[PDB]
Amino acid sequence: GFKQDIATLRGDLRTYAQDIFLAFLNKYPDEKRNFKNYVGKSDQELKSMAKFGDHTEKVFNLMMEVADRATDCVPLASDASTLVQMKQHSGLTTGNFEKLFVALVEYMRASGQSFDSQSWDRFGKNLVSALSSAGMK
């Protein structure tokens, strides 16, 4: 289920964080609007790079903590507030977060593995709702 999937992802976090964020960028190419340093790069080029590997892993590290601190796939209001009030998220709308979670759930369904994709879909919905409540547009 959801907890075990946090353990699975954390067990190979660099690889999963890169693969899921490339799935997001390829599914939603307009989302490179928030990442100008990533335009005109193939996935292997993006991986080779330092900002990429570092920011992707730090994003997934914090996403797994927010997942871990959730009850029944409902994140803490404190975690949503933090995500809304991060300077690096000044540009962002809940739509950016929805897209990331759609890509995450489609990655999990396509994997050969027994991820609880319905729980991740619920978690993404619930985080978007929490982000709205914490004051993201």
Ligand code: HEM
């Ligand atoms: C739950 C989902 C997300 C989490 C946990 C998260 C977390 C973080 C973290 C920890 C950083 C700092 C990374 C560092 O220190 O280098 C960061 C930066 C950033 N995030 Fe998010 N983020 C999430 C979703 C998103 C989405 C959906 C977007 C855009 C579509 C986004 C755009 C950015 C950008 C542009 C930066 C700045 C570049 C950087 O410093 O890495 N994030 N995010």
Ligand SMILES: Oc1c(Cl)cccc1Cl
């Ligand atoms: O690689 C990144 C990710 Cl995965 C999220 C936000 C910013 C960057 Cl640079």
